[PDB]
Design a protein around this nucleic acid. Structure first.
Ligand SMILES: Nc1ccn([C@H]2C[C@H](O)[C@@H](COP(=O)(O)OP(=O)(O)OP(=O)(O)O)O2)c(=O)n1
Ligand SMILES: [Ca+2]
Lengths: 411, 974, 399
DNA sequence: AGGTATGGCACTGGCCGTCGTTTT
DNA sequence: AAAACGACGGCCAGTGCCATAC
């Protein structure tokens, strides 16, 4: 199939990490894979930055929050969650013969009810900060708390731990508008996923219900083998908030116009690792002329491509070319454009191989310097989308690139 | 009585006694015999109709001896003061223009020999008024000039004299021109050219309560007197098919041409700069005197035009009802609230999304195409071989790392080298090239870097461009598409061996062979056009819904949607790309065409202090909400038939699925405590033509087969003519309307059969031809009986043609004269179809005028709290207080009743069939929509009116329910 | 101290009053940070990343995980993960109990998983495969920023956000590289501080491993470690890949050699605390460096028509955000307080400039500007404010 | 011979401003 | 150093097709 080719490419160019047998579909989906290579790290960082800009930057009522990766204190007996234990805790009980016959089997109750657990979701940590974050907006009820972080899930060693980095928003709203807002975000998020997609149709939404009768929406991406969940929206009402703060209800009141109410809680939670994998599959695009254009390339969106520009040299006076390339490299880096220093690699291949390698790496532009660049200051530029060659004066390059990315957001 | 000689249920006994005269003459024996013979020969004399219930109403007392006198007296009473004001204008002596125009803000009145004094308001009974708006600053009025008998007036805006950094974009009444005298007498008249636009800039016009002020338009009177049709307008403008005596008595609606036609003398000169449309506020500040002079010139020309026009209009339309209706039609009014703003955003954003998805789909296809440049591979593409692939040259003027410490030297040296090489700009031409490396066809699609609307890639691509089908590799029945300059879009059929930048015909043949292995040309269609030479192929036009003469301009037209489903039109990529593109195009076409008009509508928001007390106290009064109004800029008579014209609100589409922004009319929402009561006429023109034929034939209702069939069909039972035609041919009733009215007004059989094929995809050629023949032969027979005599509609056609060929055609009901440009003397037989249609259409205009007069009389008589809202050519809406919503409904029904009887009275009939006495349904609602039950779900609002905006369903009520809810009385205490 | 109270009140440190203490903050077992603290930490991380990684061709990011599964070292001290299923299975049919407790607690060490203690081992596990990216050019580094877990004395668990660099270099030049990195890191720490002398460096020696360096910041109560550099030789790299060494070989002057490893590890949370203490040095205000201040400019409206001023401020807010400046939208509160209290609040939040829009601004376009450092008031045209702020930030960076 | 109105986008053509090359 | 001239590019005006309402 085409999936094997995509996985092979991602392995060769350090998007993923591990071996062929470790990079199975089940391991990638469950989050029990070895990890991601540097290109994957850059792609995930770009995705997280785009999410943060689209969710937090341009709103006056969304603030950041940080939740600890573990939950300490007593836990309800059950749930099969893991338990954190220190070294010497394995000795101080057995030693001195603490009723060593059978009472240390009832000690399993202590183990269940005293050892902490690893964070399973970001909702609880966000809800834990509701009261103190009410001072920021003087209790203007419609407002959100956002976070991006890693969470742990048990997966059937006999039981392993899957790690998934995900973005969560918790939005407190007046009850009478809770449904309307639920629609709004449902559209808004659905736009964001479609914004960077080459085939936004493969992103779909569906309505769903809880066993308690609570409305919700689910977002799916259509991988070649079927639909997979990537984000969930739940209208949870006020049950969790009331349970977390039993006592005087008035402490939880916020302002809806002129009235004091208890807000409904909307929870949006999306998976960033699965979203990154979805975009990787989308960019590879698994019709006679299209078939005859069998060129391997990852047409990632410019805002998400891990590497923007590739820089290299021709043949001629080496020292002067290297000096000009160093200057251009520093100039491009100092204004926020990531570069691949190809000029620092010896010559081992023709332009065809460099083009193939950079297309597999999804680099927007390839820059080439030569003697004629020293003569007149003109460089050659190749674009990933079309592969056509252009001549451009260096004095403008820094601006042009800054334009190309900046306008890409507004396509 | 309960029946007529032909056993048709007539008006109730009591209502007939109250309306018609007791001493009505009876039909003769011969007329009854002829009618019975006609009906029996057609085969309708047997059918018994189940009678409808009876209605008993104590109507308000009438004036005069009959209906005509009643309506004349009502119209004169309504229209007396404004006619007096017009006469005052006719006899005015105006001093010369002021030597210099004042600069202060507000209103200034110019006394004799130049004296200027500041006045709060003109305070005159009549005026000629004109306004100018700086289009760069938005929609705020800039400056105005007015003239009254013995005085000139100038008005300056606060945004014109003073300079400030910020001007509010939301428009309040405080930023408009004050023109209404507070609570020398009540009525005021305003005259202007395109006067509705000027009315739009009056602060008092936006109050929810009505005003006594009324407006007259010189363009409307020009249309009434000597207007021209669109075809006539084009010919007249191009005159700078056989008869041309009408040219010297007509002109276009432009003010200069009107002045030349009605006044003559020195021409009128414009302002060449056109500052108000292209200039800036400073440019207006510098050229103040010249712009004021031009405004005064336009006002004076309009005043002279009105002076010349008024007597001719009063002569050619002598019935006062016409003037009363024209006065009432110019006070339209639409309420809105904050939701309107959201409606503008939700749609716009939605549109962009649907745009983006489309462009992304096509832009990508463009990018891959660029890869075909290498090796001249493009010479083998069946779709792209004939594009411009030439490139343009770029133009110029004639070993072990160690840690370091002195990195500063390396940094500075690299930076200095970079800047030294950067300074070599002297050899760069001053005008940058535009993507010389890419191919020409791809070069066209990309913007220029200097454009402030630049975006990466070929972001100018759209489905309407002639290149898009080639990029998508569209196929028709396994044949690639192609464009010919003469014949438009077609397809190429390979196989020619008579040799019928070279055509890759072998690639096309291979593609067709591949397609065929999945199921003197040997293919039949629109026929080869050998004038197009593409060696090795035949060119066949794409079929068009209007016949083989027309040319297809775009394969992505809505009419081609079924062909995609059938698989006859297939995209190269395959899957759902083609169908999805066509669906998106259908979904966004209307917004693409109308968003500029819709988003630029002038909206004024009323502050809290200006609202009625009944709105503030209502429990539905949304605090922090905005309440405002829009005044449609309707031309009272923009058509030869004297219909109304509005660029936006008479073209608004009804709320429809899969069409973005279709909820436009649903956004017109009554304020809290107010309701919208509306009604549309049922089978209006059908009934008008039927009754004309009945009067012409024997003087009894239903004496003709056409009228007999028209009268009895009920809407609820689905037995009216529209529903019967729809069932007979199997189309929507909306398409049945088009089919019937096309047949009535001279459509030929080929047109009808093509229309049927368009509306019924499952039909074939022979079936459509048969269904057209079996509906065109029965309605009309042969010309006459000497070696329209035969046919069901022959008498109606004869009557219409007799009226058309008269020396001075007039409307049978009100006797308005047709424009001088269409009389037989000016044109012998040229524009016959337009003249024939004019009779019925102007009769419908008279119907609208009568309805408006009756509604105004009923509202004033019984102190009903409401005002006219809007009308579209047969429909009327009113804004009423909620508690009175029922009473208004009754009034509408009564207004219908009288309106029908009048139509009979002027035709010589003294009775009305019970079937057409009342509106089938009257709508009580909170928003404007075609039906009271629709929730108006569209891509712009998926949840609908009920959930997003909280607008509940309306009610539709018939006469009996209205009587039960009102007890038949219009009084405030039953 | 007053500084911690201010931090709590202005949402730099989360939790209630009783949950904050010097020991808890130093250990990393505190409730957490408020949004302002989160933004400050993010800015510090971005500065570290751009100083260490961006401008070097041979430093790459790495993606080590938070835990290591599989069989683990017997005994030893660390946090193990236990399974509730493996103890729930005993609830229905006991496995003879009695003598299996010690054996079970030994199986715990045999089979349990562990939480990440540092970022060094995660990077070492990528050395062989990350050597491909550089074509075996031996000198190169791997950088990461992430959270690590530490036991603290019932034992508790503390979380620390740390930045780690692992640098593989030929053994000949290892000491020179150690000195170079020490110099650079010390300069970076001194860069953003108002009192650079309070950052100090020291030398240290170990029985296992070569020479090393430590970086300290002088809090009012004493010197606290914030970053450590170690020259560990090659013991760990061999121990992780026993026997064959051909893969471990890297290039140097056309000859193969097993690299020496330099480890640099700094604490971002303690660094943030140190910077907060540094900035606070008779008006309570935090003179945090412009490159690190979480909030740049505050916006408010004066007395006048609410709709007009709100529209003007919304436009200005959108324009400022579009260009990368963080803004605090105080105009939504309607200015329900005096000017002195507003200035005090904005100073305690370490906001560079305060912007006020008045009805008079609608006339000519002049807004009031107040500076955090000088406290001098000025009138400026709205059209120039964005460029002024951008140039101010750039000038602060360059110096 | 359907009639009456409205408007938008795509494509073509003409004119004129302005630049760079070549004479003097 | 200043003037003839041939080419490119932007705006305006016009024609065609298509899409809305009654
Ligand atoms: N394609 C059309 C549409 C309409 N009309 C005219 C004659 C109609 O009578 C009048 C009003 O239009 P409706 O669609 O409202 O017509 P009815 O009054 O016949 O419709 P209904 O009784 O269903 O409301 O417009 C026309 O000539 N051609
Ligand atoms: Ca109708």
């Amino acid at each position: 199939e085409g999936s094997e080719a995509l996985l092979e490419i991602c392995q060769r160019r350090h998007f993923l990490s591990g071996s062929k047998q470790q990079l199975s579909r089940d391991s990638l989906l469950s989050g029990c894979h070895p990890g991601f290579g540097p290109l994957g790290v850059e792609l995930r960082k770009n995705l997280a930055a785009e999410w943060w800009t689209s969710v937090v930057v341009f709103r006056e009522q969304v603030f950041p929050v940080d939740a600890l990766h573990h939950k300490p204190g007593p836990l309800l007996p059950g749930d099969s969650a893991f338990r954190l234990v220190s070294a010497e805790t394995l000795r101080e009980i057995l030693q001195d013969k603490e009723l060593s016959k059978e009472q240390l089997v009832a000690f399993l109750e202590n183990v269940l009810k005293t050892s902490g657990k690893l964070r399973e979701n970001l909702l609880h940590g966000a809800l834990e900060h509701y009261v103190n974050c009410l001072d920021l907006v003087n209790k203007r009820l419609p407002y959100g708390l956002a976070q991006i972080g890693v969470c742990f899930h048990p997966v059937f060693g006999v039981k392993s731990i899957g790690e998934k980095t995900e973005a969560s928003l918790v939005w407190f709203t007046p009850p009478r508008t809770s449904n309307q807002w639920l629609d709004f975000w449902l559209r808004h998020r659905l736009q964001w996923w479609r914004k960077f997609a080459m085939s936004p149709s493969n992103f779909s939404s569906s309505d769903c219900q809880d066993e308690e009768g609570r409305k919700g929406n689910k977002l799916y991406y259509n991988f070649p083998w079927g639909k997979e969940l990537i984000e969930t929206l739940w209208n949870l009402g006020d049950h969790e908030l009331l349970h977390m703060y039993p006592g005087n209800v008035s402490k939880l009141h916020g302002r809806d116009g002129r009235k004091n109410v208890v807000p409904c809680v909307l929870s949006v939670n999306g998976d960033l690792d699965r979203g990154m994998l979805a975009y990787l599959y989308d960019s590879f695009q698994l019709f006679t002329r299209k078939k005859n254009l069998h060129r391997k390339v990852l047409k990632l969106h410019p805002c998400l491509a891990p590497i923007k520009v590739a820089l290299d040299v021709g043949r001629g006076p080496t020292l002067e070319l290297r000096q000009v390339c160093q200057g251009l490299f520093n100039e491009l880096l100092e204004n926020g454009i990531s570069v691949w220093p190809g000029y620092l690699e010896t010559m081992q291949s023709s332009l065809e191989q460099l083009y193939s390698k950079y297309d597999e790496m999804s680099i927007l532009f390839t820059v080439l310097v030569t003697e004629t660049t020293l003569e007149n200051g003109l460089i050659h530029l190749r674009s990933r989308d079309t592969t056509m060659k252009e001549m451009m004066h260096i004095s403008k390059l820094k601006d042009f690139l800054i334009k190309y990315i900046s306008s890409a957001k507004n396509v | 009585l309960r029946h007529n000689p032909l056993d048709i249920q007539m008006l109730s006994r009591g209502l007939h006694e109250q309306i018609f005269g007791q001493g009505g003459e009876m039909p003769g024996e011969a007329a009854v015999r002829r009618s019975v013979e006609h009906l029996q020969k057609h085969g309708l004399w047997g059918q018994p109709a189940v009678p409808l219930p009876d209605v008993e109403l104590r109507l308000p007392p009438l004036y005069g001896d009959n209906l005509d006198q009643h309506f004349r007296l009502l119209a004169q009473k309504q229209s007396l003061p404004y006619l007096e004001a017009a006469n005052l204008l006719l006899q005015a002596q105006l001093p010369p223009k002021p030597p210099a125009w004042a600069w202060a803000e507000g209103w200034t009145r110019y006394g004799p020999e130049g004296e200027a004094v500041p006045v709060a308001i003109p305070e005159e009974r009549a005026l000629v008024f004109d306004v100018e708006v700086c289009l760069a600053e938005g929609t705020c009025p800039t400056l105005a000039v007015a003239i009254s008998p013995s005085a000139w007036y100038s008005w300056c805006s606060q945004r014109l004299v003073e300079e400030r950094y910020s001007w509010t974009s939301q428009l309040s009444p405080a930023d408009l021109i004050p023109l209404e005298v507070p609570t020398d007498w009540q009525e005021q008249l305003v005259v202007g050219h395109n006067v509705s636009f000027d009315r739009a800039h009056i602060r008092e016009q936006y109050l929810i309560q009505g005003s006594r002020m009324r407006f007259l338009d010189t363009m409307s009177m020009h249309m009434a007197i000597s207007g021209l049709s669109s075809f006539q307008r084009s010919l007249w403008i191009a005159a700078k098919i056989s008869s041309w005596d009408w040219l010297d008595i007509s002109s276009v609606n432009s003010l200069a041409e009107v002045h030349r036609l009605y006044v003559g003398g020195p021409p009128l000169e414009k302002e060449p700069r056109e500052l108000f449309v292209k200039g800036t506020m400073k440019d207006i500040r510098e050229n103040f005197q010249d712009l004021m002079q031009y405004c005064a010139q336009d006002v004076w020309a309009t005043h002279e035009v009105f002076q010349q026009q008024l007597p001719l209009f009063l002569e050619r339309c002598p019935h006062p009802v016409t003037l009363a209706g024209m006065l009432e039609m110019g006070v339209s009014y639409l309420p809105v609230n904050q939701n309107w703003e959201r409606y503008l955003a939700e749609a716009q954003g939605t549109y962009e999304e649907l745009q983006r998805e489309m462009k992304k789909s096509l832009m990508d296809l463009a990018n891959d195409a660029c890869q075909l440049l290498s090796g001249e591979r493009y010479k083998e593409d069946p779709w792209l071989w004939d594009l411009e692939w030439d490139l343009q040259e770029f133009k110029q003027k004639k070993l072990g790392p160690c840690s370091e410490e002195e990195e500063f030297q390396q940094d500075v040296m690299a930076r200095a080298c970079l800047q030294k090489l950067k300074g070599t700009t002297e050899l760069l031409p001053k005008r940058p090239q535009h993507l010389p490396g890419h191919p020409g066809w791809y070069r066209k699609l990309c913007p220029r870097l200097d454009d402030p609307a630049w975006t990466p890639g070929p972001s100018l691509l759209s489905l309407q461009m002639r290149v898009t089908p080639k990029l998508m590799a569209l196929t028709w029945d396994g044949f690639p598409l192609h464009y010919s300059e003469r014949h438009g879009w077609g397809y190429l059929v390979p196989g020619r061996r008579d040799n019928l930048v070279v055509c890759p015909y072998r690639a096309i043949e291979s593609l067709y062979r591949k397609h065929c292995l999945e199921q003197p040309s040997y293919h039949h269609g629109n026929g080869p056009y050998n004038d197009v030479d593409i060696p090795g192929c035949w060119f066949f036009k794409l079929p068009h819904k209007d016949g083989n003469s027309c040319n297809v301009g775009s394969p992505f037209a809505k009419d081609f949607l079924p062909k995609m489903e059938d698989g006859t039109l297939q995209a190269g990529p395959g899957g759902a790309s083609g169908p999805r593109a066509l669906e998106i195009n259908k979904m966004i076409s209307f917004w693409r065409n109308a968003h500029k008009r819709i988003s630029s509508q002038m909206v004024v928001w009323l502050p809290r202090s200006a609202l009625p007390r009944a709105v503030i106290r209502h429990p539905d009064y949304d605090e922090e909400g905005l309440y405002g109004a829009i005044l449609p800029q309707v031309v009272t008579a923009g058509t030869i038939t004297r219909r109304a014209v509005e660029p936006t609100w008479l073209t608004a589409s009804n709320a429809r699925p899969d069409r973005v922004g279709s909820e436009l009319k649903a956004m017109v929402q009554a304020p809290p405590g107010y309701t919208l009561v509306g009604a549309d006429v049922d089978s209006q023109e059908l009934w008008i033509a039927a009754v004309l034929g009945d009067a012409h034939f024997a003087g009894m209702h239903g004496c003709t087969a056409f009228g007999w069939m028209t009268l009895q069909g009920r809407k609820s039972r689905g037995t009216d003519l529209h529903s019967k035609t729809a069932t007979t041919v199997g189309i929507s009733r909306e398409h049945a309307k088009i089919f019937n009215y096309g047949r009535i007004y001279g459509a030929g059989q080929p047109f009808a059969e093509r229309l049927l094929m368009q509306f019924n995809h499952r039909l074939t050629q022979q079936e459509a031809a048969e269904k057209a023949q079996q509906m065109y032969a029965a309605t009309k027979g042969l010309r006459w009986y000497r070696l329209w005599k035969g046919g069901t509609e022959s008498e109606m056609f004869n009557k219409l043609e007799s009226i058309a060929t008269s020396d001075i055609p007039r409307t049978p009901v009100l006797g308005c004269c047709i424009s001088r440009a269409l009389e037989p003397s000016a044109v012998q037989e040229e524009f016959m179809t337009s003249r024939v249609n004019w009779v019925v259409q102007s009769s419908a205009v008279d119907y609208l005028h009568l309805m408006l007069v009756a509604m105004k009389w009923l509202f004033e008589e019984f102190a009903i709290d409401g005002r006219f809202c809007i009308s579209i050519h047969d429909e009327v809406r009113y804004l009423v207080r909620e508690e009175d919503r029922y009473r208004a409904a009754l009034a509408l029904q009564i207004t219908n009743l009288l309106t029908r009887c009048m139509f009979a009275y002027k035709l010589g009939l003294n009775d009305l069939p019970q079937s057409v006495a009342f509106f089938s349904a009257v709508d009580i609602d909170r928003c404007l929509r075609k039906e009271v039950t629709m929730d108006c779900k569209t891509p712009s609002n998926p949840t609908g009116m009920e959930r997003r905006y909280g607008i509940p369903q309306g009610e539709a009520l018939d006469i009996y329910q209205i009587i039960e809810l009102t007890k038949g009385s219009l009084e405030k205490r039953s």
